[PDB]
Design a protein around this ligand. Sequence first.
Ligand code: HEC
Ligand code: HEC
Ligand code: HEC
Ligand code: HEC
Lengths: 106, 106, 106, 106
Amino acid sequence: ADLEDNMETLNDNLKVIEKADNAAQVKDALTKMAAAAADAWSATPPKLEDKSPDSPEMHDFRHGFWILIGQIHAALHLANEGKVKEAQAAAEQLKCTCNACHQKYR
Amino acid sequence: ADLEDNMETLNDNLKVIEKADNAAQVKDALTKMAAAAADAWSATPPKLEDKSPDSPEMHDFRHGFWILIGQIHAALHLANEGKVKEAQAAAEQLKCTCNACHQKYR
Amino acid sequence: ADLEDNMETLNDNLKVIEKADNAAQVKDALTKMAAAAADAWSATPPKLEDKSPDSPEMHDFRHGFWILIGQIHAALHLANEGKVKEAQAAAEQLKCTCNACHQKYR
Amino acid sequence: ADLEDNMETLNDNLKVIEKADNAAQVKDALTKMAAAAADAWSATPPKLEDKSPDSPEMHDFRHGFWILIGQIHAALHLANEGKVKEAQAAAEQLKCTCNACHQKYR
Ligand code: HEC
Ligand code: HEC
Ligand code: HEC
Ligand code: HEC
């Protein structure tokens, strides 16, 4: 799927996590977030569409999703352990990473 | 694309890197390797097909790719700084990660 | 060093970076920030001193440093490729991560 | 707190994990490993004393500990979930990251 589908999957699961009640909610939402970020790896954003795929901006772009997935999986670890409040806090902290990349390349 | 084709992308680009002469060849191959690993995120391997998608086994399958990509990117940073023998050495050490997953899920 | 000393080091190098002129300056400041974060790994912040050192808050405390270092190394790459404004922007965006840990445990 | 010592706590705790019976042994040992890896961040290994403190090699050295600690925490969450075999296997697959750094810099 293209970047646009995947981003809007990222945003919706962040909200599912916020108005979540039980851990299963959060686990599934976090799992789907990790896949959407992984799926967005191949995409080239429009402002980088004239860059070559091994440029410093393009590399930082992909690296950003790699950091996001590491952060998603850590929150997924809190969800697996039944820590619903913590995973939700961890899910809200993800938008340092969402905003960082939007600022630079969106 | 196909998990198989993704593995072939990793294996063949490992071959390019070993034979390469300049940093740009290795930089490019490493970048194609990270892409192939990200794409394989969505795959279910044949020996894990009758496990739950949220099983500890399918989660570990993905964690393996996250570690791989991190190591690929670590090898790219050396290539970026033009240390080609060092990047090629670092690319060789990746087969410990390829193999670690293979024992488990191939 | 001190948790305080490590914070002030983190604080001072953000200012060095904004006021930098060349990539070597940003690179150097970023490298020290990462060292101060790793060094803080062992600290117990005053608001968590009566918590188990293996509690999810103390694990989350260290994890925050692990995320910060990842973000520092990502901005270091842009500086390594000599893109000083891009690195300066990325450095400033680390503050979102500083703030996140402060709201929880400062 | 010296590199030699930090390596030695990493090696002994990986053996403790290898011989553990209950999760509490694994959790305690993994926790000590993550701490030793962070403590070694500042070291210059003997084979890199003729490089810039910010050479691509010295950065790649520090980066290895950052990837290691991530792997350590991922196995720790398995132990937290009382999955001792999975934690033990995760701890064993850690060798790739130990060996990779040894091959390059020991
Ligand atoms: C972290 C959790 C998030 C969340 C919730 C979102 N993103 Fe991103 N994003 C990136 C880029 C380059 C774009 C532009 C895409 C385009 O212009 O075609 C976006 C876009 C979005 C949107 C708007 C989607 C739309 O329908 O147009 C939304 C809602 C969104 N994002 C949410 C790039 C990145 C990243 C690059 C490394 C990362 C990380 C994120 N975004 C993270 C997130
Ligand atoms: C690391 C750099 C590598 C390299 C060079 C290769 N792989 Fe993998 N791989 C995984 C699984 C489950 C399979 C089985 C696929 C199936 O049977 O459907 C494979 C397979 C391969 C092949 C064989 C291709 C063929 O058609 O026979 C090759 C050449 C290959 N790989 C190269 C799973 C993983 C991982 C999980 C986390 C990781 C990491 C890797 N593989 C890494 C690598
Ligand atoms: C993972 C946790 C964490 C992160 C990340 C973090 N901090 Fe802090 N920092 C703290 C805590 C907790 C305190 C309060 C300690 C105290 O009061 O003794 C603190 C204190 C401080 C202080 C004030 C020190 C004092 O005593 O006056 C400054 C300035 C500061 N941090 C800056 C930063 C900057 C800049 C960053 C990021 C670049 C950062 N911190 C990242 C946890 C964190
Ligand atoms: C990022 C780099 C890095 C990582 C990761 C790393 N090492 Fe090391 N290790 C070194 C270096 C460099 C030395 C050499 C120190 C010296 O010569 O004084 C060393 C030395 C050692 C030694 C002392 C043995 C001897 O004969 O000198 C042991 C034991 C050891 N490492 C075990 C481990 C284990 C176990 C792991 C992971 C679980 C690990 N190392 C991961 C860099 C690393």
